[PDB]
Amino acid sequence: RPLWLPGSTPPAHLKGDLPGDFGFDPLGLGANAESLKWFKESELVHSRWAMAAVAGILVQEIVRPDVFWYNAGKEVESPLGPLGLLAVEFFLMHWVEVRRWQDLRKPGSVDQDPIFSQYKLPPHEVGYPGGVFAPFIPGDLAELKVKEIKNGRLAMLAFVGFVMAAQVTGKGPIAALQEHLADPWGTTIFSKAAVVPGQAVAPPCKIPASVSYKGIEIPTPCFLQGLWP
Amino acid sequence: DRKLWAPGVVAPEYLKGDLAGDYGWDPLGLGADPTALKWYRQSELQHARWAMLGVAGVLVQEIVKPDVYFYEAGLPQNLPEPFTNINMGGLLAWEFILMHWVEVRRWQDYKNFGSVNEDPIFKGNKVPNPEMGYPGGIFDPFGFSKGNLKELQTKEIKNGRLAMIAYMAFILQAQATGKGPLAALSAHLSNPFGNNILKNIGTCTVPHSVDVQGLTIPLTCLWPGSQ
Amino acid sequence: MKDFTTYLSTAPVIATIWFTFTAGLLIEINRYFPDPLVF
Amino acid sequence: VRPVWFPGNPPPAHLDGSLAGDYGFDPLFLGQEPQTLKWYVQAELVHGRFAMLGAAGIILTSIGAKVGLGFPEWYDAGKVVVEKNNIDFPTLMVIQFYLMGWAETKRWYDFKNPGSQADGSFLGFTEEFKGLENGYPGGRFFDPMGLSRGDAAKYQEYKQKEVKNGRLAMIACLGFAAQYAATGKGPLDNLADHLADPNHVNFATNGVSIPIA
Numbered sequence: 157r158p159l160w161l162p163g164s165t166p167p168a169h170l171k172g173d174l175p176g177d178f179g180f181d182p183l184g185l186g187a188n189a190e191s192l193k194w195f196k197e198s199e200l201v202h203s204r205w206a207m208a209a210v211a212g213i214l215v216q217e218i219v220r221p222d223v224f225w226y227n228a229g230k231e232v233e234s235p236l237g238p239l240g241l242l243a244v245e246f247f248l249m250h251w252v253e254v255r256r257w258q259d260l261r262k263p264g265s266v267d268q269d270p271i272f273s274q275y276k277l278p279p280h281e282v283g284y285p286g287g288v289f290a291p292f293i294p295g296d297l298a299e300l301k302v303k304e305i306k307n308g309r310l311a312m313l314a315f316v317g318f319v320m321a322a323q324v325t326g327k328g329p330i331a332a333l334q335e336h337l338a339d340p341w342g343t344t345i346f347s348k349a350a351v352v353p354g355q356a357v358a359p360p361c362k363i364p365a366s367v368s369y370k371g372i373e374i375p376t377p378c379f380l381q382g383l384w385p
Numbered sequence: 386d387r388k389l390w391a392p393g394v395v396a397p398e399y400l401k402g403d404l405a406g407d408y409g410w411d412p413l414g415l416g417a418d419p420t421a422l423k424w425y426r427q428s429e430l431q432h433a434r435w436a437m438l439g440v441a442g443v444l445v446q447e448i449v450k451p452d453v454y455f456y457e458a459g460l461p462q463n464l465p466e467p468f469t470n471i472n473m474g475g476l477l478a479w480e481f482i483l484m485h486w487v488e489v490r491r492w493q494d495y496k497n498f499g500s501v502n503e504d505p506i507f508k509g510n511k512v513p514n515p516e517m518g519y520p521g522g523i524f525d526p527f528g529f530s531k532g533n534l535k536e537l538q539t540k541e542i543k544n545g546r547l548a549m550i551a552y553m554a555f556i557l558q559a560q561a562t563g564k565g566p567l568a569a570l571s572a573h574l575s576n577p578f579g580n581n582i583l584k585n586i587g588t589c590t591v592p593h594s595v596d597v598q599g600l601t602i603p604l605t606c607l608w609p610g611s612q
Numbered sequence: 613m614k615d616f617t618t619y620l621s622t623a624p625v626i627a628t629i630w631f632t633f634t635a636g637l638l639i640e641i642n643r644y645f646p647d648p649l650v651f
Numbered sequence: 652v653r654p655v656w657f658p659g660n661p662p663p664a665h666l667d668g669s670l671a672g673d674y675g676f677d678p679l680f681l682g683q684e685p686q687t688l689k690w691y692v693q694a695e696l697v698h699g700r701f702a703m704l705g706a707a708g709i710i711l712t713s714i715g716a717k718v719g720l721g722f723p724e725w726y727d728a729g730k731v732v733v734e735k736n737n738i739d740f741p742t743l744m745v746i747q748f749y750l751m752g753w754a755e756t757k758r759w760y761d762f763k764n765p766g767s768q769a770d771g772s773f774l775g776f777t778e779e780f781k782g783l784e785n786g787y788p789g790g791r792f793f794d795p796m797g798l799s800r801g802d803a804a805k806y807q808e809y810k811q812k813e814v815k816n817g818r819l820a821m822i823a824c825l826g827f828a829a830q831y832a833a834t835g836k837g838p839l840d841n842l843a844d845h846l847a848d849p850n851h852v853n854f855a856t857n858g859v860s861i862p863i864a
């Protein structure tokens with residue numbers, strides 16, 4: 157059985173039943189059954205959101221290289237007002253999140269379509285709706301679940317790297333990759349900063365502190381700039 | 386019985402001569418704990434091999450490049466072509482990643498003996514690893530382990546201890562005279578009564594700090610000598 | 613500790629602490645409200 | 652058997668190693684009585700947690716002050732916050748005393764009567780205020796991750812880590828107060844001054860700690 161540390165003993169609460177189980181829990185956060193049940197859904201939702209976000213950022217830079225993703229919320233103008241879009245998103249997200257939360261706390265209780273009584277999701281597990289949500293499932297379910305959780309973890313780390321690279325270099329993912337490929341020995345984080353007992357140098361925050369959006373002055377500070385190496 | 390580290394001294398109970406190069410020397414009793422003894426043996430082997438490599442590197446470097454000081458060879462401007470004036474960040478990144486991988490593998494081997502012998506990518510590529518700190522196989526392609534491994538291990542630990550003492554000697558000689566081991570030996574051979582530890586001591590030739598490209602690295606001697 | 617608290621509960625120690633508290637309260641009142649003659 | 656504060660001396664009879672961070676340190680026998688010891692355990696836990704929060708906040712603000720972020724020192728942050736923002740100091744004091752009074756009064760009456768706050772008289776909540784042990788209030792509110800209701804050995808290890816970190820944070824807060832009273836600068840400023848010259852920039856050369864120096 158593959159593990160995050162070959163030759164180590166996995167935790168007792170991690171028996172390898174859940175997909176993506178590699179015996180990684182040094183803090184013992186998943187020891188409780190209810191906590192593990194909640195964290196499983198949290199990881200699945202985080203994985204899917206990060207996967208969609210990373211794919212969207214890459215496609216955004218490929219299709220629109222002149223638009224920075226970090227500035228995408230500012231330099232995008234639509235006939236629909238920002239407050240109207242926020243209201244639409246709030247209502248739709250509230251509806252779907254309440255339905256998902258109710259399915260989590262009460263399994264097999266919101267599988268029925270409230271509009272049409274002839275549509276109902278078949279019995280499933282928490283975090284894996286299926287039915288109308290899965291019109292095509294090519295391959296084994298367990299193998300695909302492992303692939304999904306692994307791709308989701310990679311995408312989560314990728315989004316964190318996207319944010320950090322955008323705050324340190326001020327460029328997109330493809331732009332940062334090209335900049336690093338041009339001079340690999342002088343573009344890493346080690347080449348940009350270093351800390352010693354006599355001096356502590358950190359890279360400057362390329363993101364401006366304030367952003368003017370229709371006369372509102374939205375503050376945009378780099379994530380934990382003081383703790384930057 | 387084996388010869389101890391001193392005439393008339395009594396070896397400790399835990400030092401029965403099982404390990405190579407055992408002289409019953411433990412004035413601090415640090416080897417009383419078996420787990421601590423195994424960890425200290427691994428640490429001694431690592432120090433021995435690294436010190437042997439350092440001593441050989443300093444000697445070969447002084448022979449091939451006598452115009453380059455080994456103490457200041459770490460500066461980017463003293464690096465050979467085409468690594469001269471290279472970015473130290475990328476170099477540190479390369480070393481950190483590679484050394485971190487190999488040291489984590491070695492550490493896991495120490496925690497769980499015989500559990501990381503197999504290659505994680507190409508299955509079937511394993512090392513025999515008869516004892517801790519002695520992997521063998523790909524690490525010994527010439528096959529010198531199929532014989533008296535005890536005397537060879539004794540030779541290795543003794544040469545490593547001698548190299549540890551020698552490397553510290555090189556460091557103090559460079560910090561007190563400002564020259565390499567061969568240069569210090571030649572200087573002492575020129576006038577033994579004029580160039581020795583009686584007059585070279587008390588002076589620290591190492592500067593206060595050095596500006597490596599952009600950041601400054603503080604430096605100091607092992608003893609409070611005159612800067 | 614029980615015996616020490618019992619000793620502190622004796623009449624002279626209790627009287628000393630109580631009178632020190634009462635005197636301190638009166639002194640602080642006269643300090644923050646100097647020369648009070650009438651209500 | 653267990654390590655004590657002063658090696659060779661037997662630990663006191665009222666300290667048997669059951670509590671977290673037990674090293675038999677009680678030369679004045681302050682916690683000799685069982686009820687007094689229980690009260691002191693809760694006091695030490697509260698002190699350690701408050702000191703941990705204070706030390707972390709002081710270190711973070713000092714880090715932001717050392718780099719060009721505009722953060723103020725810990726001994727001037729209160730004045731800077733009250734003057735920069737239109738915040739009335741007595742109003743903030745009253746609000747904090749109200750919230751702290753409610754939380755501390757509930758904790759106090761739970762100490763006097765264990766499990767009494769679980770009756771449901773506070774908005775119907777019952778299991779969230781039952782309390783696991785003295786000074787360790789488990790539940791879904793104080794422990795949402797459930798690290799205290801799973802892997803008992805890990806829970807005991809975390810208890811030892813918490814009490815030791817709390818004691819270290821208390822010593823750190825005392826050090827912050829003494830360093831500001833002596834040198835007059837921030838804690839990271841003292842750390843940088845010491846790293847610049849450790850042989851001549853310390854408490855033995857500040858001119859305040861040792862008056863005969």
Ligand code: CLA
Nearest residue numbers: 204205208209211212213215216217219220223228229232
């Ligand atoms: C986390 C998901 C996510 C989010 C928040 C965004 C957000 C944004 N994208 Mg983007 N995108 C995404 C995923 C996402 N995208 C993915 C996965 C792709 C690959 C197909 C793309 C490809 C893409 C392109 C090519 C472009 C953007 C652009 C933009 C920006 C303005 C466009 C807009 O929203 O107007 C409204 C968008 C529409 C009206 C299109 C129709 C909306 C469809 C029909 C909704 C489909 C819903 C879907 C089935 C449900 C999946 C939900 C899932 C994410 C959880 C905006 C900040 C534009 C930009 O760069 O700004 C200048 C731009 O050109 N995106």
Ligand SMILES: CC1=C[C@H](O)CC(C)(C)[C@H]1/C=C/C(C)=C/C=C/C(C)=C/C=C/C=C(C)/C=C/C=C(C)/C=C/C1=C(C)C[C@H](O)CC1(C)C
Nearest residue numbers: 207208210211290291292307310311314317329330332333
């Ligand atoms: C359900 C269903 C069913 C039916 O039947 C059908 C259908 C409809 C099809 C469906 C759907 C699906 C979906 C949605 C999918 C998606 C996915 C994704 C997005 C993934 C990603 C995923 C993603 C991922 C992993 C990502 C990754 C990334 C990465 C690593 C990155 C990296 C980087 C960085 C950091 C930075 C730099 O500068 C660059 C680089 C270097 C490059």
Ligand SMILES: CC1=C[C@H](O)CC(C)(C)[C@H]1/C=C/C(C)=C/C=C/C(C)=C/C=C/C=C(C)/C=C/C=C(C)/C=C/C1=C(C)C[C@H](O)CC1(C)C
Nearest residue numbers: 411412413414432435436439442443455458549550552553
């Ligand atoms: C046993 C015991 C126990 C009992 O109980 C007690 C007592 C007595 C305490 C004891 C003893 C101890 C001792 C003696 C110790 C010592 C050690 C050492 C010397 C080490 C070194 C060790 C050493 C070492 C590792 C070293 C290494 C080195 C190196 C790598 C080098 C490198 C280099 C080179 C090449 C050159 C170039 O240019 C640079 C560099 C980079 C610089």
Ligand SMILES: CC1=C[C@H](O)CC(C)(C)[C@H]1/C=C/C(C)=C/C=C/C(C)=C/C=C/C=C(C)/C=C/C=C(C)/C=C/C1=C(C)C[C@H](O)CC1(C)C
Nearest residue numbers: 677678679680698701702705708709725728821822824825
């Ligand atoms: C045990 C015993 C018994 C026997 O028998 C005898 C003897 C020996 C006496 C003993 C001992 C004792 C001791 C040591 C004690 C100590 C304690 C402490 C230090 C505490 C602190 C403690 C401390 C603490 C809490 C602290 C806390 C802190 C805090 C909150 C802070 C805050 C803040 C901040 C953030 C910043 C801003 O800007 C300001 C402020 C606002 C300021």
Ligand SMILES: CCCCCCCCCCCCC/C=C\[C@H](O)[C@H](N)CO
Nearest residue numbers: 768769770771772773774775776777778
């Ligand atoms: C617009 C009205 C919104 C609500 C206004 C404030 C009401 C807040 C009251 C919270 C409910 C407190 C009691 C909660 C549960 C009760 O204990 C149950 N009946 C159990 O006995």
Ligand SMILES: CCCCCCCCCCCCCCCC(=O)O
Nearest residue numbers: 744745748749752753755756759760
């Ligand atoms: C600035 C001061 C504001 C004072 C705010 C007081 C808020 C109520 C405090 C009441 C505490 C009562 C504690 C119970 C006493 C007891 O248990 O004996």
